[PDB]
Symmetry: D2
Subunit: 235 residues, 4 copies
């Protein structure tokens, strides 16, 4: 506890899976968390599971006007952002032969386009010395059947952590990417066979790695790709 | 010669790296289709190449232009041995400056158009063919005001991995080339003055171990390696052609 | 606060710099620490700075018999090892033209040879589920003038984290490499503000900052992290 | 007449596998080649298979006095070096628990120590603008059971290509690493082919062709890289 004491965190995709596990860990570490998603019922249930120091905000990150509304609320309730975890994303499998323009747009709108504007519109509220975490994926460095657009989109996310390291260094804002392997979320058994640790990861394990990047334990860590995959991409 | 009687399609082939590659390919015995949007430059490029070339006007962001392109290739040559997906463009904008229109322009040409260029080439691509994607050193660097371009070129490199896996049954190799600073009309188009362009150039030469910008013919020669049988056991890679910039 | 509660840690090169800063953090998190080095007075002064739950062990990690002695002491006093931080290393600058066999041998003996046998001889004591941290360097992915053998040796260190991930997975032992950038340690003046200019964060790192990253890898917070290279360099190698 | 016309190339480990395959391709491209190895009969059969424009040199590259002899022969017969392919290496499998000091010393002496001094002593003869190719391995980026010392040594080899890029840039000498995957040579069943997208082991001639790219002027703007020649094994 106390490892994020009194810090204000915004987590997109915070109503399920990894974002929710991270929201819980952040609150346990003393932070106040805004969880962001499109479904209000799931946001309300997630916020109830978190139990304290949480505000749920309905927002589609692909809509600029929803991001403006999100940050107006953050400005009303807390006034600034210390930690931003841009975790909203979705995987849809299509082979190259199968790719449609709509499939391409759905993948890049949420994973890249919405991520760019999520971070852009947080800049006025981000405090100097803050920490931004981007969700990439092991897919960003692999050649996975039928993951064409998702893998390419997550590779784009990792690149943005590099560029934003350079652009935000004057404000001492650190930007790092986390690249999860197989995590037991709503997003089968071969992932456990291909991973040295021999199992899929738990969402709490990804939350703990994101906590490292959000916390002062990583104060000299900038621009990296932190693989949290039980060794999958490393051997 | 090293591409004797091979059929090559080069998008962005009317200038810079694509044109130098077209010239080298024809010099190695290939028949080349050069593809671009500008008719004056396509005709002059085809005239400079001089032989074994068909210029095709096509905007890779328009699906119907890609259909027409591959109808022309099917009629004139019947199949594709080498596909060099080289069309792309850089516009400098910082994170604060990014507009939806800037983002869309960058990813439409660098990623969307690249995906459908390769997708629509699949029926004509021969088993054992070679596909080369143009990424960039920007795809592994953190360059001021290159947010969308660098991210887009990282996406391009990822696709070489995915398509290696998906096309392995047809023995089609897919590889990415990542140029450093190459002396083309593109280095001068992203800046607003030629006092800036000479700064960007001698800065690139100073950060590169070989101490100079690359010549377009040098990138063409690396693309030739990936197109030729010399790379028959090379698949999914990122070939940096940058004078050592990203390697030290 | 107690993230290494009841854990036994062995830190080679714990006499000073990163190893010493890591030893302090480990003890603050509840571990019992063995610090290992060649100089006894400096070990005693370091252990006094640590203040509690520490045993200093004199050992030259390049000498197989000193490693045997080290682990015999660990076996009597604590019985097992939970965390191994192999931090012994040294930089000597020589250009390719300048390299002698002795310069080559000294660099790889401490950086690679001594590390291999430090880990080999810890295996009988390493508990299932333990964590091993190897010290690589940003030099392992760079082309730095006159760092020929040091950079190559640190690249070898990072490779071993991969191989040992595969070999030790049946025992659920995680092996990870930390790759420090410029850290303000006794490894020195004015080349420091040279490194600070090349780093996005605009500064050299503090040893406590590297210690915090090693703690992450040692702690259960990194329980799904295996085989990685964790760059702690203010962005130097990442942009 | 060709891509290496009248160029002088030195290939260590040139009496078998990739070394020999590369020597043959280099000669086919117009080069004069020195092949280097320890065994006289096999160097002698290697030179006979190449057939022309080749000098066999008996030398243990881990012995500094043999390297001096090697480069004296190169200077006398050809006068300078355009391409250096430092290809000597060997795999011995030992797990961490099994590693002995003798095993470690043998692995690093051939793969790293001998490689360093091979390149060091070639420096006086290397032409400005020359090309140096180092043999790394896919093992240098993988976690392969019982490959502890070999993988670490090949990782060291790839690192040296970066450092020497920086140190030799004033002479415009390019240094690049080639990292072979599974290549069908006497140094070695379906497991390698099953993990590789191209679905087969590589032919020695295929690695030779990749080394030729790095040796030839086609790679004149390529420096410090790791060229994977592995059918996609490490790339997907
Ligand atoms: N699980 C894995 O193995 C894995 C591996 C690599 C990367 N990731 C990435 O981790 C992140 C979270 O995924 P997950 O594993 O936790 O599965 P998940 O439970 O499905 O999480 C998806 C989250 O993103 C939200 N979301 C999706 N689209 C959104 C949109 N336009 N606007 C706002 N919110 C949106 C979702 O809430 P709403 O639908 O209500 O909006 C939800 O909270 C993603 O970026 C994912 O690609 C996961
Ligand atoms: N230092 C470098 O030069 C460098 C570095 C990294 C990557 N690259 C990449 O190398 C590739 C070649 O660019 P270049 O350096 O040689 O400059 P360039 O070719 O002179 O300019 C871009 C080329 O792509 C074509 N193009 C642009 N948009 C197109 C579209 N919708 N459809 C069809 N063609 C299009 C252009 O032809 P039209 O305008 O007539 O259509 C032109 O031929 C690019 O992808 C570039 O990003 C270059
Ligand atoms: N500082 C940086 O910027 C930086 C950057 C990259 C990597 N690193 C790595 O980080 C590690 C920690 O070094 P440091 O920077 O903190 O310097 P340091 O610890 O101040 O000096 C090296 C330490 O290793 C010990 N050591 C050296 N040879 C030994 C041997 N044969 N047996 C036992 N112990 C030995 C030394 O103690 P004794 O001499 O008393 O034995 C000393 O405590 C090193 O491996 C270094 O290569 C540091
Ligand atoms: C197209 C511009 C680009 C940029 C590279 C440099 C040269 C290397 C260092 C560098 C630092 C920068 O920060 C402001 C910006 C640019 C740069 C080129 O030269 C060609 C491709 C690459 O995209
Ligand atoms: C020697 C200290 C060390 C390497 C120094 C650098 C890294 C930064 C760039 C640099 C440029 C130089 O001039 C040619 C010389 C050295 C250097 C660091 O600090 C990081 C690891 C390693 O211990």
């Amino acid at each position: 506890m106390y490892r994020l004491l009194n810090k204000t965190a915004v987590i997109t995709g915070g109503n399920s899976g990894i974002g929710l596990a991270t929201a819980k860990r952040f609150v346990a570490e003393g932070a106040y968390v805004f969880i962001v998603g499109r479904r209000r019922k799931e946001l309300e249930q997630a916020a109830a599971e978190i139990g304290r120091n949480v505000t749920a905000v309905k927002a589609d990150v692909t809509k600029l006007e929803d991001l403006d509304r999100l940050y107006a609320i953050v400005r009303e309730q807390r006034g600034s952002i210390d930690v931003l975890f841009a975790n909203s994303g979705a995987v849809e499998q299509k082979t190259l032969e199968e790719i449609t323009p709509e499939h391409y747009d759905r993948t890049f709108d949420v994973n890249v386009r919405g991520l760019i504007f999520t971070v852009q519109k947080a800049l006025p509220l981000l405090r100097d010395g803050g920490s931004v975490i981007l969700t990439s994926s092991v897919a960003g460095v692999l050649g996975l059947q039928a993951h064409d657009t998702y893998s390419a989109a997550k590779a784009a996310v990792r690149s943005l952590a590099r560029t934003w390291t350079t652009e935000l260094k004057g404000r001492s804002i650190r930007v790092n990417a986390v690249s999860p392997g197989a995590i037991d979320t709503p997003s089968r058994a071969k992932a456990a066979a291909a991973t040295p640790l021999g199992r899929v990861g738990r969402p709490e394990e990804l939350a703990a790695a994101v906590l490292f990047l959000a916390s002062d334990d990583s104060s000299y860590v900038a621009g990296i790709e932190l693989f949290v995959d039980g060794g999958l991409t490393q051997v």
